[PDB]
Amino acid sequence: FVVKDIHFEGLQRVAVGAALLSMPVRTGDTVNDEDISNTIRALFATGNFEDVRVLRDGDTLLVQVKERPTIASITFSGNKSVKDDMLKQNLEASGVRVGESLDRTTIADIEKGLEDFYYSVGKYSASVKAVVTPLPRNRVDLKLVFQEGVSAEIQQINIVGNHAFTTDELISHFQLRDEVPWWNVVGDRKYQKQKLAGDLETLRSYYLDRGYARFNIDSTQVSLTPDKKGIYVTVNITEGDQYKLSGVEVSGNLAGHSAEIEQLTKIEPGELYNGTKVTKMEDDIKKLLGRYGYAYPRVQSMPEINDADKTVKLRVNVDAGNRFYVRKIRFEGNDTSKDAVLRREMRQMEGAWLGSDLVDQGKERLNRLGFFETVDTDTQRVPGSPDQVDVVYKVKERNTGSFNFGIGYGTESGVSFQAGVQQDNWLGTGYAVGINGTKNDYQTYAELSVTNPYFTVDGVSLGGRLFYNDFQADDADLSDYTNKSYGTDVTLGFPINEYNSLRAGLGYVHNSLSNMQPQVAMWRYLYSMGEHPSTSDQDNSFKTDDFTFNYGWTYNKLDRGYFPTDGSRVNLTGKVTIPGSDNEYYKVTLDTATYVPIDDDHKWVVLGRTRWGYGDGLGGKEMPFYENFYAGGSSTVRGFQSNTIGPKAVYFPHQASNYDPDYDYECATQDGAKDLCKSDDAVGGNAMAVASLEFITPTPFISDKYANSVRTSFFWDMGTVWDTNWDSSQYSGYPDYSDPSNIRMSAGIALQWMSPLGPLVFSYAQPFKKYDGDKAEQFQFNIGKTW
């Protein structure tokens, strides 16, 4: 059939010319049923038509077509645990989005994709349905109805074939959990394939670190209950016999550094095989080769196992590689943070030979900064250069501001409130400004802090702080006096050894003392300052302005920040009033904490804590009584009431402010007082020496599945505080408070773990060596006051 005209009907978006080009047939040619069929098939293959009804009139070839409807809107219903925006992004990534044509063939595909996503999440009964609503002008709206079920939670994790280690012990280190006590935080009971792979690898490492070279995981099974509300995980393993390490052999193109590597591959003949040690040796070899310029020093270990004598001979293959030089280091995604902020965290120098370890260290430092949600690296090659690369870092910035609130309770400070707003990255400059405030029974504190982490390119930081502090002594178990003080303080920080950190600075503090109960020590100090108050009223007042030079040194080596098992932390703090200040004194403090594990697993530890302090005046004056040292409580000597160790106040006779019988008053004239009098109110001392020896043991009764999250210890605390300026000769009848021989000792048991309410620490101690006036307090606890 000859065609004189080709016409189209129903076209909406596809151009007539484009469709005509698409058709094999063209106007002015013979045409047959086969040609009609081919044209229809091609038109449908275009992918923009739902039905094609190519037709022939008497002379004209009429074509009726129905284009795929355009999506007008997308709606969701029932996506309780999946956000609407998350569903929208998933769908556009799949391909379906507003404004495009609704392919009536992919409804099932989309539904199955969503169901697969839900199954990955953990909801195995989730059902997804799509409702399509036609609209005028060839428009269609799709509605996705969701039937999310109940998430499936692990009911048991079992290991079959383990004879040397209990299944609970093995699961203790797993990410997946089958028991979640309400009184502890260990994680959720959800299942994920990534978690399963991770904890399988963790089990493999656990077994390989004990010498089980032939360890093997036969297979793993994941099962569901018929209701699909629970998951059972089984792992079958074949643990072999323990193997010794006969020796280490190194071969390959070491690049003339053989002598230096044999020193890195030295072991005691007859040592238990250890995969962690093997990996450390490989990393050390890689670090050496990198230090000598090579960028990709591949290292492999292929142990040879001899079952006759149970010995392992390591075969290490080392290939130095080539040297690559970094031409540029680029940062992309730092819309807010400036370039220098990201660049100063780099251990890899631009224009120098490449190092994979250095690049990884830079990435880790960028992650530690905390300003970015994600950090990625890409070592792009330079076209036309076989040994030059460009390192590119892609960072997704994250919000840094944070409101904060906190509530805690304890025996010492009672109810503690905290509140503050922080900004770790001020306008992408690296400055960390913030205002904080705390309040407890005896003190309310509020400070405004500004710090520059990099005052010098090396890493020196310049601080800054304005603070206001109100201190109520009587609420702190001391002699009655109120001290409302405010001041400023700027300090520097010098990192010197990656563990040690010096710091020096200046400061100005104004102290306004009022509501002071007359007593020997306070009046001695006041006389030393030239004041001549009266020992008759509690309405005294006193103000001073002091400029101090504060210095300190902090050594930190603890392996872990929480429940450390090895290392030592030493902190030294100082202070001295520079001339021109009302006060003239120096103060020194020293805190120590040493952990000495006594087993390979680091489950039995010995903790030794000591605290020291001393201070005195310079120009014939006394150290301020509000700078004294206090001992006793849950932090210095457990079993004693907080701030109870040390000298006790000796009040003079004085009429009370507002006398009212039925209330205990301290040695007042209205009760028949005509001479000085001893009391039991702590005042502290200018010298302090506290020591503690604590033995840490595993929790005996808690299930071994999560017994590592609770720390049990038996302690023996010692302490003493004395006043070096006390004049024993004048006050002969009263106890001599200048004698340091009065050592207070206590012992007991303490518990400590993390709870949803916050960190918990409980302690029961029985002070078996106390002196007159000391108030004992056996049970002590602190819930969340560490925030």
């Binding site: 944070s402 904060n404 906190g406 509530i407 916050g758 969340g784």
Partner: peptide, 7 residues
């Protein structure tokens, strides 16, 4: 307890 919300 300590709540921390990011602004």
């Amino acid at each position: 307890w300590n709540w921390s919300k990011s602004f």
